[PDB]
Design a protein around this ligand. Structure first.
Ligand SMILES: OC[C@H]1O[C@@H](O[C@H]2[C@H](O)[C@@H](O)[C@H](O[C@H]3[C@H](O)[C@@H](O)[C@H](O[C@H]4[C@H](O)[C@@H](O)[C@H](O[C@H]5[C@H](O)[C@@H](O)[C@H](O)O[C@@H]5CO)O[C@@H]4CO)O[C@@H]3CO)O[C@@H]2CO)[C@H](O)[C@@H](O)[C@@H]1O
Ligand SMILES: [Cl-]
Ligand SMILES: [Cl-]
Ligand SMILES: [Cl-]
Ligand SMILES: [Cl-]
Ligand SMILES: [Cl-]
Lengths: 984, 985
C-alpha cells in the first residue's frame, strides 16, 4: 500500500476547479470547492464569492442541495454560478442547467451575507457573532474576563480569571491554577471546559423547549457580543421568547469571596399569554486534585461529596462540594441561584448532583431526567450540579435569574474554614439582594474600562482602528499585566510569573499612574526587585516564592528598564531609597539603588567571557540557544566564584574565569541598562555614580563594537570553547553554521533590534543590517525570528526539529520579536541622516504592523484566523494563519510601537515629540493624559513620507510657535494644544 | 447560611416512605422513593418491588407518569401500590385513587421484569445486558480484551489491551502505554475513551437512521453480550434492520502489525425491499505525546497531520496520522474498512479528518456533515477520522463491514519506518481477504480460552459458580498477569507493570505450564528479576526501563515466593544459574541465586531498625501507610549507607543506622522468603546455604516473637522516632492511637494474615487473634482492613487523612487483604488441633468468600454494584457497594483460596491433599491437570463440618486404599481417580 500526506497532496480543490472551469465561466476573485471522492479526481464548487469562506461545507450540510447534487456529482465535476438573480449549475463538458426553485432559494439564502460569516466589529470594538456560522479558528470566538483586586493584598496572585466562548462555554479560575469550574484536558483546542458549564435548559409543561448550547429549529436567531470584560448572548425563539445572558466577573469588595462570577439570564415573554416555565441551570465544579485526573480519577471521586446550602429561613439556595482531605479544604466552592419575578424573590426548588441520573438514557443536549430532579446528595463523584426552579412569565413581563458561582480561599483569610465561606457568601447575597444592584455593578465595570484607557486616545477617521487601540488593546495590556501568560483558551496548565514578563509593565504603568494607582506600580516594582539575589542574578519564575535562581542570564537586565521608565515619568527618585528583602532569604534587606548596582556589576564585571561580554549560561531571552551543555545556574556560579576568589587571592568583582559562550543580546541589554542607570543617577543628583556609569557604558560599547561586529551583521553568540578556531561566533556572515546553502550565515533579528534599541549601531551598520534583513529576514507574512541554522555542529546534544515548516521554531513569524524589531526600526527612522533609509524603515515597520493589528483579521478571516480583538502569538509562514495563545508579549510592544509612531517619548526634559506617519495619511489627531495636565496633539502633512529630521515643519504649543522639539510636562491642571504642520 | 453534607443527611427517602406509609399499606420487602423537593419533607415512592432498583427515576423519566404526578407531588407524599392487577396511588391521609388507564399501563410496563434490569448470566458465564436500563455502577458493564503474543519476542511488554463497555465505548492500547485509540482523562469514571471510538452512523437517502451509541424511538431492542475476550452487540430497528457488532483483538501472527483490533458489523435487511444505505465509521487516534495534553494541546495538534492509504490498485482504504518528530515516528497507527456484499469487496468512498467539519452545527449524536464528507486531509489537529461508504442490501441478505484499527511499532522491527507499517498492513489485509477467515480467527480465540482454563475445572451442581471460576476468573487472572494494574476502565495512567503484582504469577503460572509454556514462565521470572538492584531494592514500576527505585520496602520479597512456587511445581533448579542483568544498568549480570541472597540480605541485615525488623520506607504493601515523613528511596539509602561505611570503618552487610519505623508485615514476608530459600537450597543440594537460611529464619522468628507480639495481637508498625516513649508501636492493644473510644487499640488484618501465612504465630496466638477479629474486624460486609485509627497524631498524609471512613484503606473491606486473611484462615484450619476453632475459621472464610464471588453481584445488583464477571477492589462499609478498579489482587488470591479449599497444595513430595468443604455441601468433584498426568478428585461427606485432621476418612487412589495423604505426581500420561469419603461418628 501507499501513503499520501496532507502536505504532499499539492493540488487543492480550488486549483482543480480553476483548471476545469477557468475559461468556461468567470470564477471571480474568490471561489470555494471540495473534493467529491477520496481519489481527488473530481471537484464540486461555487464561484464568484466576495471572500474566501467554507461555503461548500454549509451547502453540503443542507439536505435539499445535497440531494440535488447527488444526482449530478458522484463522478462528474460541477460548479455553481449566479446570473440574473438565478443559480445555474455548469458541468465540465459545458452544459448550463437552471436549478429548480427550492435549491435556488437555498443557494440564494446561503450566499447572501457571506462577508459577515465571521462577524463584524461595532463602533466600540465589540465583536458581534452569529451562533450558526463556522469558526475561522479555535481562538476566533474567545473572550477573556478579568476581576479587580486593586487595593488588596497580592493583586497578581489572587486576581480571578475566566475564558468564555460564543456559546458561553469556557472556564473560571481563581488564584494560581485553582479551578472553580472544571477545565477539560482533551485532544481538541476548542474544548476548554466541561460542556455543562454556564448552560441551562428551559422546560414548558414537562417538555424541553430551550437549551442554551444548542441551536435547533425553535430558535429564530441567536447572537453573541464580546466586549471588554463582559459577554452578552441573545436568543429569540419561535414561541416569542427573548433570552439574554450576561456573564461577567464581580469586582472584589470587602468581605466578598475571593472569586465570583455572575451570570444574569433575562427571559421576556413577547407573546400575549402567560407562560409557566421551568429552568434547570447546570454546571460542573473543578477538582482540587488536578494531578489525580491523570493518575487516579477514582481518587478524585471518592475524596469529595455534595452539600446543600440553606439561607437564614431554611430555604435551599445552592450546592457546594465538600472535601475530606485537610489540604483540599483550603478552598471552598459554591453556586447559588435567585429568581426575580419583578420585585419578588424565589430560590431553586430542586437539585441534582449526579451526572448519570441527570442525563439518564438521553444526552447532555436532551437529558432524560432534566425536568424532574431527584434531590439526592451524591456521596462521591465529581462536583456536577443542576438547580431547577419553576416560574411564571406574564405577557410582556420579564423574569431575571441571577447565578453566582464562586470560590473562597485561605489565601485571603486567616484561620480559614467553611464558616468563612458561609459568612462571605452571606455578605455577597446580602449585597446583591436588590435587583438593580447587579446592573449598577455591571455599569461600574464598564466605567472602569472606559476610564483606564483614557491615558492615550486616538481620534482618526478609521473607527475600527480607534476602537481597537483605545479599548481592546488597553484591556489586553491590563489583562497581561495582571495574569502574564498563565491562562487562556489553550493555556490550561500551571504557569508561574516569569521575570521577563515585567515587560508587560512597560506599557501598562502609564495607564495606572493616570488613574491614581502609582502605589500599585511601586508595589509591582518592589515585588520584582525582591526576586534579585545579592550577586545580581534573579529567579526565573515566582508565584508565591521564587525558584530557579539565575537559570537564565538575561532576566535581571530587564528590571532596570522598568525602573527607568517609572523614574522618567514620575520623577520619583525616592524608590531608590526603599529597602527591599533580597532573594537570598534569611532577613537581609538592601536598597534599590544597591540592587541595581549589583545587577549592573553581575553582567559588566563578573560572569563575563574572554571578550568581556555577558555569559550565555543555559540560555538568554531566546530559549533555543542551548549552546553550552555544561551550563550552571546562579547558585553554582556563585559558589564556584567564591572558591576561585579564595584560591587565587582575588578581589570581589573580578571576572569569573571560564570558557562559556557569550551573549551579544545580553550585551546590548547591559548597555541599555547602564545608560538608564546613568540617567537615573543624573536625575538623583548622584554625580559620581552617573560618571562611573557613563564610563562603563563607553567601555562596553567599545567592547561590543570591537568583538561583535562581523563586517555584515552583529553576531548573536560568541563561542570560546573551541581553541582551534573551528567555530568562534554565531549569527553573522562566515560563521559556517548556516543550514541553508543559499544563505552565507545565520542571522538573528534580535541582534539588529537590540543593536538599534541600545544605541550601539551606527548609521552605516544600520543600513547594512537593513539590507540584510530585506534580503533574508523579510517574508511576505512578516519578519522571521532567525534564518535556518545547524546548531548540531557546535552543540551535538541538540535534538531534531519538532514542527513542520512554518510552525513555531521552524520558520514562523513570532510577533513579539517582530514587534521589537519594529520598535528598533521606528527608533532608527527618527534619527538616521539618510532620508531614503528612514523612509524604507518606516515602510517596513508599517507593513509589519498591519499584519499584527487584530481588527484587520476580519478582512480575510477564514484564511488568517486569529482573533479580531486579541493579539495572537505567531503567524504560520506556510499558510498565513495567526496561531498561538492569546497571551504573549505582542500586545505590550504593539502598544509601545503605536505610541512611538504617534511621536510620544518620555525623556528627562519632558516629552520628545517626533511623529512618523503613514505616507497616505494626511491628518493625525490624538489626546494624551498626563498626571498633572493633558495634551491634544494634531498633526497635518501632505501625501508622502515626512519627518522633522528632513522635512520642513512648524510646531505650535498653546498657539505659540516654538523651535525646541521637547514639550515640557506642565503641572497647571489644564489642557494644552500642540499643532504640527509639514510643508512640502 | 447553613451547610448540610450528604453524609450528615441521615434520613433517606425509603425511611421516610416507611414512616409515612408503614401501617396504611403493605410496602412489601422492597420499595423505591425519591424526595419531591429540596426541603426533604415529602416523598414519592412505589412499594412491593422484587428488589432494590431505581424505579422512581425511570418513572419520572416517563412523560405520562410525570404529568400525572405533577398535580400533587410538591406538598404531600404519594405512594404507588398494585392491587388486583391494577395500580393505585395512596396519599398521606389514607385516600386510595385508581390511576388512569395510560398511567396504569405505563406503570405495568415499567415494573415488569425488574429482576433483570441489570441483566443476567448465561450458562457459560456470559453477561447479557439490556442497553435501555440504568447502570448499577461505572464498572458493571465493562469487559476487558487482551491479545496473544505467545511465541514472539518480548511477549509481556507487547501484548495489546482494550476496554469495551456495553455501547462499545472505550480505548485501545498497545505496548507500554502507547494509545491506539484516544483515552479520555476527564472528571467522570464512565468516560474511558473518546466518545467517537468504535461508533458508526447509518444513513438512508441523506437522513440519519441509526447511531450505534444512541438509543432512540427507531430501535425496538438492543442487547450486548460480554464474553471471554470478545464482545457482541445486537440492535433491531423499527425499519426491519438487524445490526450485529463483534469486537475482538486479533491474535498476533507472523508479519502482522504489533496491535490490531477488529470490529465486524453485519447488517441484515429483514424487509422485502432492497435498501440503499450509507455507513460512516468514526473514531479518534491516540496521541503520541500523552503528556502535554495537560500542558499545551496546541503542541499536540501541530506536530501531526493526516494521511490517506491507497492499496496497490490505487483505491483509498483508510487514514493514518503522520508525525514530524522522530520521537513519535517510532509507532504508526492505521484504520481500514472493507465492505463485503456477499462475495464482492468494496472500500470506503469518502473520508473526513476534521471534527469541527464533521459535527458542524449539530452534535456528535446528530452530526450536520456526517453524510457528505469533504475528503479533506487535515494539516494539523487531533487524529479524528470518519470513513464513509455506500452499499445496497437486498431483501433477506446481509452486508458485512470489517474495520481494522491497529498500530505498528519499532519494538518488533529493526530499521523501522512507515514502509514497515505499510508492508505489515498489506500482510494483514491479505490474510483477511476471505469473509470466513475472520470467523475462523474468532473461533481460535475461543479455543485458546477454552484450553488455557483446563488446568483446574470445577464440576459442582451450581452452574453459575462453575462458569464464574472455570472461565471468568481464569481470564481475569491471565489479564492481570499480563497487565498488573496498568490499564483498565479507570486505571488509565501513571501505573506500569508493578513489582508486587508478581503475585498474579502465583496463580497463572500453573495454567501456562499446563499448555506447554513453561519457558514463558521462566521469561516472566527473569523479566521481574531484571528490575532488582545489586543491594536488593527493586523498581516499583517498569515498562521497558524501571522507575521509582526502592521507593517501597515490601517489593522484591514476593520474588522469593514466585521462585519457590515455580521450583516446587516444576523441580527445575536450573533457573538458579541464569545470568540476569541487574537494575543498576551498565552491563553487569548476576546469577539468580546471588540476586535472591542479596534480596534476603537487604532486609535481614541492612535496612533494619533498632529492633532488627525491616524498615518501612514510606510504605509497605499498604500504599497509604506513610508513617515516616522524612523517608528515602533505594538510591539515597545506598549512597548514605556507603558514606556511613566509609566514615565509620565498617563492612558491607552491617546495619544502616537510622531511626525510621519498622514494618512487621515486611518481617513476616522476610521470614517466609527465608524459609522458601532454605527449602530451595535443600532441593538444590546446597547444604551450607540451607543451614544458614534455617538459622537466619530461626533468628528472625525469635526477633518477631520478642518485639512484635503485644499480648493481644501482632503489632503493625514499630515506631522509634519518639525517644520520650509517647508512641512506640501501632497495631495492637495499648498503642494509644485508636479513634474509637470503645476500641482499646488499632488492629490490622494483615498482621494476623501474614503471621499465620508465614508460620510464625502459635495456636494460642491464632485463637487470640481470631477472637479479636470476630470482636472488631468482622463486619456484615466482610473483614475490614483496619479498625478506626487516629494516625494524624503521629503523621499526616495517611489513609485516615485522605478518605472518608469506609473507603479504600480507611477501614473499608479491602478485598485483597480480605482474601489474604481468608488464605491464612484456610491454612490454619487444616492443622490446628482444636476442631471448634477450625470450624469457626472455615465458616468465616466461606462467609468472606461468598461476598467476593462476582456472579453473586447479580442477586442485589443495584446495591452491591461491582461487576458480575470481574472482581472489584473494595467494598464500602457504609453502603455495601463494590467500588474500585476492575484490576486487583482480589482475583488472584480468590483463585488461590478456592484451589486451596479443594485441598490442592503442592509440596516437594507431590500434592498435599487436604480439602475443607462447606458445612451444607455433601459432594465435591473436580478435575486437575498435571504436566505428565491428570487427576479426577471426588469428595463425599455428610452434612456438617468435616476435615481429615479430626474426622474419620477413607482415601482411594486408582481404587487402592492408601494411608499417606500426599498424592505423588505421576508421569504415565494417564488419568488417576482420587476418592475421599468422610464417615460420621
Ligand atoms: O496497598 C494498597 C494496594 O492498592 C493500590 O494502592 C493504591 C491505594 O490503594 C490508594 O489508596 C492510593 O491512593 C493514592 C492515589 O492513587 C494518588 O493519586 C494520591 O496522590 C495524591 C497525594 O497523596 C497527595 O499528597 C497529593 O497532594 C499534592 C497536591 O496534588 C498538590 O496540589 C500539592 O501542591 O502538593 C500535594 C503534595 O503534598 O495529591 C495527590 C493527588 O493529586 O494519593 C493516594 C493516597 O496515597 O493509590 C495506590 C496506588 O498508587 C495498589 O494497586 C496495590 O498494589 C496496593 O497493594
Ligand atoms: Cl489562549
Ligand atoms: Cl534571539
Ligand atoms: Cl496493611
Ligand atoms: Cl478499572
Ligand atoms: Cl489491589
Amino acid at each position: 500500500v501507499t501513503k499520501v500526506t496532507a502536505r504532499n497532496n499539492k493540488i487543492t480543490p480550488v486549483e482543480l476547479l480553476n483548471q476545469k472551469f477557468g475559461n468556461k465561466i468567470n470564477l471571480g476573485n474568490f471561489a470555494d470547492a471540495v473534493f467529491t471522492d477520496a481519489a481527488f479526481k473530481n471537484v464540486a464548487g461555487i464561484a464568484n464569492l466576495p471572500m474566501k469562506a467554507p461555503v461548500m461545507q454549509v451547502l453540503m450540510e443542507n439536505c435539499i442541495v445535497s440531494k440535488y447534487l447527488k444526482q449530478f456529482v458522484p463522478d462528474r465535476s460541477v460548479c455553481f454560478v449566479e446570473e440574473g438573480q438565478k443559480f445555474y449549475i455548469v458541468l465540465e463538458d459545458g452544459q448550463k442547467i437552471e436549478v429548480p426553485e427550492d435549491v435556488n432559494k437555498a443557494l440564494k439564502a446561503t450566499v447572501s451575507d457571506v462577508k459577515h460569516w465571521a462577524g463584524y466589529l461595532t463602533e466600540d470594538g465589540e465583536h458581534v457573532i452569529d451562533l450558526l456560522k463556522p469558526a475561522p479558528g479555535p481562538h476566533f470566538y474567545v473572550n477573556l474576563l478579568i476581576g479587580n483586586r486593586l487595593g488588596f493584598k497580592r493583586t497578581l496572585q489572587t486576581t480571578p480569571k475566566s475564558v468564555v466562548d460564543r456559546f458561553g462555554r469556557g472556564s473560571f479560575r481563581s488564584h494560581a491554577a485553582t479551578q472553580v469550574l472544571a477545565t477539560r484536558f482533551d485532544m481538541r483546542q476548542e474544548e476548554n471546559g466541561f460542556p455543562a458549564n454556564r448552560q441551562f435548559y428551559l422546560y414548558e409543561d414537562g417538555k424541553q423547549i430551550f437549551y442554551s448550547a444548542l441551536i435547533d429549529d425553535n430558535i429564530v436567531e441567536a447572537t453573541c457580543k464580546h466586549s471588554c470584560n463582559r459577554t452578552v448572548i441573545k436568543y429569540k425563539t419561535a414561541c416569542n421568547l427573548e433570552i439574554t445572558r450576561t456573564i461577567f466577573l464581580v469586582p472584589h469588595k470587602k468581605g466578598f469571596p475571593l472569586a465570583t462570577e455572575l451570570q444574569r439570564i433575562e427571559i421576556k415573554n413577547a407573546s400575549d399569554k402567560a407562560r409557566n416555565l421551568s429552568i434547570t441551570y447546570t454546571g460542573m465544579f473543578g477538582t482540587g486534585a488536578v494531578h489525580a485526573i491523570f493518575e487516579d480519577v477514582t481518587y478524585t471521586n471518592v475524596i469529595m461529596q455534595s452539600a446543600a446550602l440553606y439561607n437564614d429561613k431554611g430555604e435551599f439556595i445552592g450546592i457546594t462540594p465538600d472535601y475530606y482531605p485537610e489540604e483540599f479544604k483550603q478552598d471552598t466552592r459554591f453556586v447559588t441561584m435567585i429568581v426575580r419575578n419583578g420585585d419578588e424573590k424565589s430560590f431553586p426548588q430542586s437539585f441534582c448532583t449526579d451526572y448519570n441520573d441527570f442525563v439518564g438514557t438521553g444526552t447532555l443536549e436532551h437529558p432524560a431526567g432534566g425536568c424532574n430532579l431527584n434531590n439526592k446528595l451524591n456521596r462521591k463523584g465529581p462536583g456536577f450540579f443542576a438547580l431547577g426552579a419553576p416560574f411564571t412569565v406574564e405577557p410582556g413581563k420579564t423574569v431575571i435569574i441571577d447565578t453566582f458561582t464562586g470560590l473562597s480561599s485561605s489565601k485571603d483569610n486567616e484561620n480559614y474554614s467553611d464558616a468563612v465561606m458561609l459568612r462571605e457568601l452571606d455578605n455577597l447575597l446580602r449585597y446583591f439582594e436588590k435587583s438593580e444592584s447587579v446592573e449598577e455593578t455591571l455599569n461600574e465595570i464598564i466605567n472602569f474600562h472606559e476610564n483606564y484607557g483614557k491615558y492615550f486616545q486616538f481620534n482618526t477617521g478609521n473607527k475600527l482602528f480607534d476602537s481597537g487601540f483605545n479599548r481592546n488593546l488597553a484591556f489586553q495590556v491590563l489583562y497581561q499585566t495582571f495574569m502574564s501568560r498563565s491562562f487562556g483558551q489553550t493555556q490550561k496548565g500551571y504557569r508561574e510569573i516569569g521575570f521577563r514578563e515585567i515587560q508587560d509593565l512597560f506599557a501598562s504603568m502609564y495607564y495606572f499612574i493616570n488613574i491614581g494607582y502609582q502605589d500599585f506600580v511601586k508595589e509591582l516594582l518592589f515585588e520584582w526587585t525582591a526576586n534579585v539575589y545579592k550577586m545580581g542574578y534573579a529567579n526565573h519564575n515566582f508565584y508565591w516564592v521564587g525558584k530557579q535562581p539565575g537559570l537564565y542570564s538575561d532576566d535581571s537586565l530587564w528590571l532596570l528598564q522598568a525602573y527607568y521608565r517609572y523614574i522618567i515619568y514620575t520623577k520619583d527618585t525616592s524608590v531608590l531609597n526603599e529597602e527591599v528583602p533580597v532573594a537570598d532569604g534569611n532577613n537581609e534587606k538592601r536598597a534599590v539603588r544597591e540592587t541595581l548596582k549589583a545587577i549592573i556589576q553581575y553582567s559588566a564585571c563578573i560572569s563575563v567571557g574572554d571578550h568581556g561580554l555577558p555569559l550565555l549560561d543555559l540560555a538568554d531571552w531566546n530559549d533555543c540557544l542551548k549552546i553550552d551543555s555544561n551550563s550552571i545556574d546562579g547558585a553554582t556560579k556563585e559558589k564556584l566564584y567564591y572558591e576561585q576568589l579564595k584560591k587565587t587571592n582575588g578581589k570581589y568583582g573580578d571576572r569569573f574565569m571560564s570558557d562559556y559562550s557569550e551573549s551579544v543580546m545580553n550585551a546590548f541589554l547591559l548597555k541599555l541598562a547602564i545608560d538608564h542607570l546613568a540617567e537615573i543617577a543624573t536625575l538623583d543628583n548622584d554625580t559620581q555614580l552617573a560618571q562611573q556609569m557613563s564610563e562603563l557604558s563607553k567601555e562596553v560599547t567599545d567592547r561590543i563594537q570591537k568583538h561583535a561586529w562581523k563586517e555584515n551583521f552583529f553576531a548573536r553568540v560568541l563561542i570560546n570553547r573551541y581553541k582551534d578556531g573551528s567555530y568562534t561566533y554565531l549569527g553573522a556572515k562566515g560563521d559556517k553554521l548556516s543550514a541553508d546553502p543559499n544563505i552565507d550565515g545565520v542571522y538573528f533579528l534580535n541582534s539588529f533590534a537590540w543593536s538599534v534599541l541600545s544605541d550601539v549601531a551606527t548609521d552605516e551598520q544600520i543600513a547594512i543590517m537593513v539590507d540584510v534583513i530585506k534580503k533574508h529576514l523579510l517574508t511576505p507574512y512578516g519578519l522571521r525570528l532567525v534564518t535556518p541554522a545547524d546548531l548540531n555542529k557546535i552543540a551535538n546534544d541538540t535534538a531534531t526539529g519538532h514542527y513542520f515548516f512554518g510552525d513555531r521554531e521552524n520558520g514562523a513569524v513570532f510577533k513579539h520579536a517582530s514587534m521589537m524589531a519594529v520598535a528598533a526600526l521606528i527608533k532608527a527612522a527618527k534619527k538616521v541622516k539618510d532620508n531614503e533609509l528612514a523612509k524604507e524603515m518606516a515602510r517596513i515597520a508599517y507593513f509589519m504592523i498591519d499584519l499584527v493589528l487584530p481588527y484587520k483579521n476580519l478582512e480575510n478571516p477564514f484564511q488568517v484566523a486569529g482573533n479580531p480583538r486579541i493579539c495572537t502569538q505567531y503567524i504560520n509562514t506556510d499558510t498565513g494563519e495567526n496561531i498561538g495563545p492569546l497571551l504573549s508579549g505582542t500586545a505590550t510592544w504593539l502598544n509601545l510601537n503605536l505610541i512611538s509612531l504617534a511621536g510620544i517619548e518620555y525623556t528627562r526634559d519632558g516629552i520628545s515629540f517626533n511623529p512618523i506617519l503613514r505616507e497616505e495619511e494626511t491628518q493625525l489627531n490624538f489626546t494624551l493624559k498626563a498626571p498633572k495636565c493633558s495634551y491634544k496633539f494634531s498633526i497635518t502633512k501632505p501625501v508622502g513620507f515626512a519627518r522633522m529630521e528632513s522635512s520642513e515643519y512648524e510646531l505650535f504649543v498653546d498657539g505659540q510657535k516654538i523651535d525646541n522639539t521637547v514639550i515640557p510636562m506642565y503641572t497647571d491642571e489644564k489642557e494644552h494644544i500642540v499643532t504640527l504642520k509639514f510643508k512640502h
